[PDB]
Structures are given as C-alpha cells and as structure tokens.
C-alpha cells in the first residue's frame, strides 16, 4: 500500500483525555501520550503529522516500528497500526493535518480528495 513504510503509524485511543473531552484536550492527550516514547512534547509535535477527533479518535506519527510497539502498552491506546496514504498524489494520510503542533487547513480541492 502506498505510504505504508512502517515509519508512519496510526495510533487509536479510547477516551483521550477523559469523558466529553474537547478537541483541544484530545490533541494535548495525543501529544502527551506520544511524548512518553519519544522523550518530550516538543519532539512529539515534530513527529505527529495528523490528528483525528471524529470517525475515530487518534493520531498519525512518524516513528520507527520499535517505538510503535512501546505505545501498545500505554494506558489509553487501543490500536497501533501501520499508516498508508488516503491521497497518494499528495502524500496525505488523511484526518486533520497537523504540523508542528498546529492544525493546518487543506485547500478545498484537497479536502475533497480526502473525503470518504
């Protein structure tokens, strides 16, 4: 599958962070969770390329396969699976684009390419 290089991982979580959490609170939880295996929150922001707060709750990050297995044990983590492109022409793994800790909006044309 294109984009599936086992260097990009989709991490699905149960209730980050807690019941009735805001988008902002889930994203902090995503960052804090990944931080526990990459050393710090700033390194975590560097590695996360997208975040999901609907359809499924989770995030995509650039980590090696060894690091991804260290995520499996962590509280709150449901699944850790190898990610692949939703839109190969733009190397887009889908969900909401997340770059350096910021949500980035796609152009309207690209958002249609990522539509299910």
- Minimum distance from CB of 29 to a second copy (Å)? 16
Q: In the chain, which residue ranges form alpha helices assigned H by DSSP?
A: 23-38, 41-47, 65-72, 108-114
Q: How far apart are CA 29 and CA 72, in angstroms?
A: 15
* Residue choice 4, 43, 65, 81 for contact with a second copy (CB under 8 A): 81
Q: Examine residue 65 and tell whether it contacts a second copy (CB under 8 A).
A: no
Q: Residues binding a second copy: what is the number (CB under 8 A)?
A: 9
Residues 23-42 that bind a second copy (CB under 8 A): none
Nearest one of 101, 2, 5, 90 to 47, comparing CA atoms: 101
**Structural tokens at position 4:** 């599936």
Note the residues at the interface with a second copy (CB under 8 A).
Answer: 10, 12, 14, 55-56, 78-79, 81, 116
């Amino acid at each position: 599958f294109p984009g599936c290089d086992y260097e990009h991982w989709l991490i699905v979580m149960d209730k980050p962070g807690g019941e009735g959490a805001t988008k902002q609170q889930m994203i902090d939880c995503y960052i804090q969770t990944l931080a526990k295996v990459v050393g710090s929150e700033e390194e975590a922001k560097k590695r996360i390329y997208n975040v999901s707060c609907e359809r499924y709750l989770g995030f995509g990050c650039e980590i090696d396969e060894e690091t991804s297995t260290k995520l499996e044990g962590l509280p709150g983590v449901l699944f850790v699976l190898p990610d692949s492109y939703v839109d190969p022409e733009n190397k887009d793994y889908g969900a909401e684009l997340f770059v350096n800790g910021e949500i980035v909006q796609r152009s309207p044309e690209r958002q249609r390419r990522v539509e299910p």
